[PDB]
Write a protein that binds this ligand. Structure first.
Ligand SMILES: O=C(O)c1ccccc1S
Ligand SMILES: [Zn+2]
Length: 257
């Protein structure tokens, strides 16, 4: 199946998932000079105080931190969004080297990694029905650069050696995703897609301008995970990013002047 290698990576995905060449694929390059301030944007509200994390899973692509989304607990609203979107999971994309790893780029600059906090529109009842809708999902995208450590990341880093291989999971209760947010909520937004198969075109992307800093030691631990399952040859989990796709008939809006 699909992955990030030479023979199954992003340039092959279109064969099984033809929407890979669709009209609102993600990620994209964010040209900061072309992005326009949008005064119709409402203030963004990231309300994560009652978040209930449950588990961390290596899915042979990245690792997912999953949340209990059975009640309105951790939600994203305002900004470009109509209504209330509930956090269901987060994960990252990263590189083999600090010069690459993010999926969005900013004036062609690649960051060392990118965090995606995935939410679904509660008007659609569950995540499965939300991914059949053009406004089913909202993904909050946050860049990571290598510099000072991010303390609120360390609980994630320290659990990784327990989910080294594909199919492994661990308890991951009481993790507070507020510790992953930068100071500013300035952001860019545009309509796009999931960035792994099945590449569904359901996402309002909200990409924060301010990166968070993580330490070289934190990101090195990401790079010690494995794409392979236990008892199989080691293939390090690195470079699990999709590159920027054509912007097509879209405009990137900025929340800031
Ligand atoms: O983030 C993604 O791109 C993704 C892709 C497939 C399934 C779930 C997700 S959340
Ligand atoms: Zn992602």
């Amino acid at each position: 199946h699909w992955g990030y290698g030479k023979h199954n990576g992003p340039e092959h995905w279109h064969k099984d998932f033809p929407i890979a060449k669709g009209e609102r694929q993600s990620p994209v390059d964010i040209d900061t000079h072309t992005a326009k301030y949008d005064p119709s944007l409402k203030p963004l509200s990231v309300s994560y105080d009652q978040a209930t994390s449950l588990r961390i899973l290596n899915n042979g692509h990245a690792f997912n931190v999953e949340f209990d989304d059975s009640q309105d607990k951790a939600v994203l609203k305002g900004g470009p969004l109509d209504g209330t979107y509930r956090l269901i999971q987060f994960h990252f994309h990263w590189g083999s080297l600090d010069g690459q790893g993010s999926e969005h780029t900013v004036d062609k600059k690649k960051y060392a990694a990118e965090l995606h906090l995935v939410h679904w529109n509660t008007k659609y009842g569950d995540f499965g029905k939300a991914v059949q809708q053009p406004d089913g999902l909202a993904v909050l995208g946050i860049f990571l650069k290598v510099g000072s450590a991010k303390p609120g990341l360390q609980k994630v880093v320290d659990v990784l050696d327990s989910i080294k291989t594909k199919g492994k999971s661990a308890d991951f209760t009481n993790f507070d995703p507020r510790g992953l947010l930068p100071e500013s909520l300035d952001y860019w937004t545009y309509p796009g897609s999931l960035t792994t198969p099945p590449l569904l075109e359901c996402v309002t992307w909200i990409v924060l301008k301010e990166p968070i800093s993580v330490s070289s030691e934190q990101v090195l631990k990401f790079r010690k995970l494995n794409f392979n399952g236990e008892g199989e040859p080691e293939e390090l989990m690195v470079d699990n990013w999709r590159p920027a796709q054509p912007l097509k008939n879209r405009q990137i809006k900025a929340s800031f002047k």
